[PDB]
Amino acid sequence: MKLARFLAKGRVHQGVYREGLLLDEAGEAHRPEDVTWLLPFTPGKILGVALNYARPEEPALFWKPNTSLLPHKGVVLYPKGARFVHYEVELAVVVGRPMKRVRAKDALDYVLGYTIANDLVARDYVTNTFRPPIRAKGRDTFLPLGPFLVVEEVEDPQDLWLRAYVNGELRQEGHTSRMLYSVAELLEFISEFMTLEPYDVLLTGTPKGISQVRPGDVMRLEIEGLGALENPIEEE
Amino acid sequence: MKLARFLAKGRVHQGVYREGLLLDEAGEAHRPEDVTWLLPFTPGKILGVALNYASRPEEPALFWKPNTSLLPHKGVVLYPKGARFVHYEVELAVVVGRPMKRVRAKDALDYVLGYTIANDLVARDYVTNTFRPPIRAKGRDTFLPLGPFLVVEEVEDPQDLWLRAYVNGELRQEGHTSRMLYSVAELLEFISEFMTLEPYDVLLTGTPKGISQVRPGDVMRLEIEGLGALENPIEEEP
Amino acid sequence: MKLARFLAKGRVHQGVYREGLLLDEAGEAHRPEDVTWLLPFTPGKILGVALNYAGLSRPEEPALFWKPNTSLLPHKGVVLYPKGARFVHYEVELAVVVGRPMKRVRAKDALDYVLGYTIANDLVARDYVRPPIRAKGRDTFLPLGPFLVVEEVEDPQDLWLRAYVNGELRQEGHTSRMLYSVAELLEFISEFMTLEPYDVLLTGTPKGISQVRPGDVMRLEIEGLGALENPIEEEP
Amino acid sequence: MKLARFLAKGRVHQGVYREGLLLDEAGEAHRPEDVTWLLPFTPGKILGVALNYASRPEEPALFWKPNTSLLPHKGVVLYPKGARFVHYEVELAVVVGRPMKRVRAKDALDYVLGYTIANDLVARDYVTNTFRPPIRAKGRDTFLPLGPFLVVEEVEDPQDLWLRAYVNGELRQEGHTSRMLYSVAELLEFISEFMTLEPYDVLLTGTPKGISQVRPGDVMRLEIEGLGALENPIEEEP
Ligand code: NA
Known part of the structure; x- marks a missing residue:
């Protein structure tokens, strides 16, 4: 089933x-x-792996603060004066049971479900990959997530198409099978040194493509069987 | 006040x-x-800052410390199996008291709840040049002893506090927050400019380099002027 | 200052x-x-006190009762009228918010532990009136807000209370008439139950022409705390 | 499986x-x-039902237990200073696993996550007929030992379990959940009809009358078929 949360007439x-x-x-x-x-x-807590689509000897892990979280239909704030702001359609994995030193072959037995994430990034603020991209990617509203927590519907996370549209125009396409490090491998690598708790989220990366957005654009990300996550953009 | 939390007879x-x-x-x-x-x-959320003790980095070298790294006073720090270069890091930890977004440096401290001590541990074996210091090196379980107190209304100037670290009762290092490259106020201004900081979010202000290597069996005791002493023994992972 | 929380463009x-x-x-x-x-x-947790407004003596001790967090409703939220109920009433009450842990606090020191104040509409379906849980703890039966007023109220026992239904004044009261003061209540409760920051104490309401019906718009006001407004709809 | 939470070497x-x-x-x-x-x-939130053991009341007599009354297995129960009649109450505790609103009795148990044991203590000295049982008599700090386990996927029928309570190693009482006036299913239907129950909310199902008076120094051990044993000693308030 596809779980969701919504506000109506003052009630959650x-x-x-x-x-x-x-x-x-x-x-x-x-x-x-x-x-x-x-x-x-x-x-x-939310972790993501950079450059995971065609490999690096180890996953390049980065953090996304909870203050970057934004729901479906929420408005993404475009950094004042920025010139290179991109969107990133990615498969988000939600942990279901505490994970510590879990083998890749068992990793999936700990997943609650999946959802869609828009891991935005403001390249203007990235000099290179030496330091963590916190100012460039951990900005407020830079992580639309949802709309659903899909449980027991995805048969294989490594076999799902990925699409993204801007103002209705399909500006991107791809598949998760081309993931350098799989979800099961990422969970294994991470859980070896860090305990993952229920509801922690893993962003699996996105393939390169046309992703530059501007104020006024409406981004719509879709992933096989996970619905569509849509978010408009506006200047701060 | 030196606020503290403890478990006694089943009650927190x-x-x-x-x-x-x-x-x-x-x-x-x-x-x-x-x-x-x-x-x-x-x-x-907890953010740290690399190379913030004595020209300085063009901008604060921020990094993240996961909440699962948190460990209380007296808790046992787990030494990574097979690691050879584990180091403690005595840092002044700043606890946010009010929501912060686009706060000027001159007003930043007005949003601070209090201060505490942090041991920003790192397993240098795992350090790399990609998003340095990497999560695998800084965010392992128990790599963030924190406490023992939330000291409020006592610290006069966060930029005027001595720092000391003891290993097995012997003083290994002495520092002073006046030697901070980016001040607490500047760090909060920099971070809150693009990231909303909520009450109880924590900022680790860095540490001066020193003789900080530790090994299994060692007992680390970090002290900061007026903030008490944070003590943690180190054991090898099971 | 009057603190408030609101949702805008997807952001809290x-x-x-x-x-x-x-x-x-x-x-x-x-x-x-x-x-x-x-x-x-x-x-x-939210505790309320019954019969706190009246040669009759005040109750030997406060008649405490509980309001579940599921009854909470924000300003403008829709209150749901119980099907077939004949006597549903609003209750305008000064709500006290605890700011520091309280255990065995003396009345003379009690107010020093209060964070702030707000308005509460402690609704009740008298038809179902033992703890009046089915009568008082129904979903949406606790509109609360709109603000958490801090450092403004000089004396909680010196505030007027007013309630309007469909823009028409229904009742006027004053907190000075409380049988047990806020200080006495917090002393009584904290003597045996630890109160934590953000716990809430509902101080009661004087009797009045407070019956409400589906379609009515209730607007409760307390001196210096603004106005809390909620329309009523029949249960769906 | 019997789920449990414990503290060891600073880690939960x-x-x-x-x-x-x-x-x-x-x-x-x-x-x-x-x-x-x-x-x-x-x-x-935690709701209990009074007089639920040997017709039956027109409707369940529901009451509240504050989270501050919660106490873990082995925790110390504080005896009210000067109280003369304090009693333990062994009850089957039901843990909600999915949001419940207007759930029919026939489907109620499908929303249950698991079960545990509860000691719903009461100081009869403070009981009267005003919102009986009064919060002052039931909602005191430490008056709700709970645990030690969250037993999931093991109880086949909550209305078919024996109840036992021991004081200082001596059997004080024996009961059985089949004697419940209102079943777990009926109680969850009654409650969810007007109040939304959320995951981890708890329902206390009551207890049969027995020789349940306890005093400072006593060690209470409550047991329920398949749920283990919840043990708590009693001490006088400071
Ligand atoms: Na009331």
Whole structure:
């Protein structure tokens, strides 16, 4: 099922998405257009692997602060004066059980589900890969996530198409099978030295392509079987 | 006030440390040796700064420390199996008290709740030149002893505090926060300019280089002017 | 200052209310009409006191009761009227927010532990009136807000209380008439129960013409704390 | 499996109880005697039902227990100074696993995550007919020992479990959940009809009358079929 959270008439609902509608805890159906989308869950810590699409001897891990989190339909703030702001459609993996020293072959047995992430980045602030890209990628609103927490629906995370649209125009396409380090490998590498807890999130990277956005653009990211994450952009 | 959190007889207490004793919410006294020390508060996000002690980096070299690295006073630090170069790092930790976004340096300290001590440990074997210092080197479990107190309304100037580190009771290093390249105010201004800092988020201000290597069996005791002493023994991973 | 929390363009803001304007963390202005009001803070446990307004003596001890966090509703949120209920009433009450841990605190020291104040509408369905949980702890039965007012209230026992239904004044009261003061209540409660920062104490309400019906718009006001407004709809 | 949480060497571990041993997230074993037991999970809101054991009341007599009453296995219960009639209450505790609103009884148990043992203590000295039982009598600090485990996927029928309570090693009472006036399913239906229950919220199902008076110094050990044993000593307040 596709779990979601939304705000309606002052109440936060934890529901399920079916046949284009949101069913709340009481079984009452809601139309997406009538509610205010929220994050499908509350993320613990969020790590991402850079340059993971065609390999490096070790995953180049980076952090995304929770203050960068943004829900579906939320507005991404374009850095004042920036010139090179890109979007990054990526498969987000949500941990379901505590992970510590878990073998790659068992890694998937600990996953709760998946969702869509827009790992934005402002290249203007990146000199090179020497220091962590915190000012360039950990900015407020730079991590739209959702709209759903898809549980027990994805058969293989390494076999999913990835698409991205800007103002409706398909400006990108790709597949996750071309992932240098798999989800199971990333979880194994990470959990060897760091305990991953339920709801922690792993961003798996994105393939290179047309991704520069400007104020006024509406980005729509889609991943096989995970719905579509849409976010407009505006100057700060 | 030196706020502290501890576990005693099954109860978690949010109290205060005074003259050697721990007082709980009701004012009842507890001996440190009879309780289990906990983190003085629950940290939100934690950022550190590399090379911030004595021209300086064009901009603060920020990095992240995961919450799973957190360890309370007296907790056991786990030495990475097979590692050969593990170092402690005595740093002044700054705890945010009010939401910060685009705060000027001259106003930054007005948003600070209090201060505590941090041991920003690093396993240099894992250090690289990609997003340095890498998460695998700085964010291992237990690599962030923090505490024992959340000292509020006591620190006059964060840029005027001595730093000391002991290993097995012997002084290994002496520093002073006046030697900070980027001041606490400048760091908060820099970070809050693009990232909202929420109450209880923590900023690790760096440490001066020294004879900081440690090995299994060693007991690290870090002290900062007016912030007490953070002590942690090191054991080898099971 | 009047602290407030609101949702705007997908972002949750912790700001302040000045001159009819909502200022976010960065100090940027927001028009109330452009945002979605939320609770001014996240409450811990909420206790209320019954019969606290009246040669009859006051109760031998405060008649304490609980309001579940699931009853909480923000300013402008929709209160749900119980199907078939004949006697649903609003209750305008001064809500006290704890700021420091309280255990065995003396009345003379009690107010020193208070963070701030806000308005509460402690709704009740008298039809279902043992702890009145089914009558008082229903979902949406605790509108709370709009602000967490700190460092402004000089004396909690010297504030007027007012309630309007559909813009028409229904009742006027004054906190000086409380049988047990805020200080006495916190002393009584903290004697046996540890109160934590953000726990809330509802101080009661004087009897009045407070019956409400589906379609009604309730606007409660307390001296210096603004106005809390909530419309009522029949349960879906 | 019997889920448990414990503190060891400064670290909070979420483990599993197998063959009298606690295994952490990494699979490493810990001896109980070497760790500090904690609550098996963090409860949301807790509701209890009064007079639920041997027709029946028109509707369940629901009441609240504050999270501040929560106490872990082995924790010390504080006896109210001057109280003359304090009683333990062995009850089956039901832990909600999925959001519940307007759930029918026939489907209720499908929303249950697991079960645990609860000691719903009461100081009868403070009971009257005003919102009975009063919060002052039931909601005192430490008046809700809970645990030691969150037993999931093991209880086949909550209405078919024996209840036992021992004071200082001596059997004080024996009961059975089949004697519940309102079943777990009926209670969750009644409650969820007007109140949304969230994951980790807890329902206390009541207890049968018995010789349950306890005094300072007593060691209470409550047991429920398949849920282990919850033990707590009693001490007088400071
Ligand atoms: Na009331």
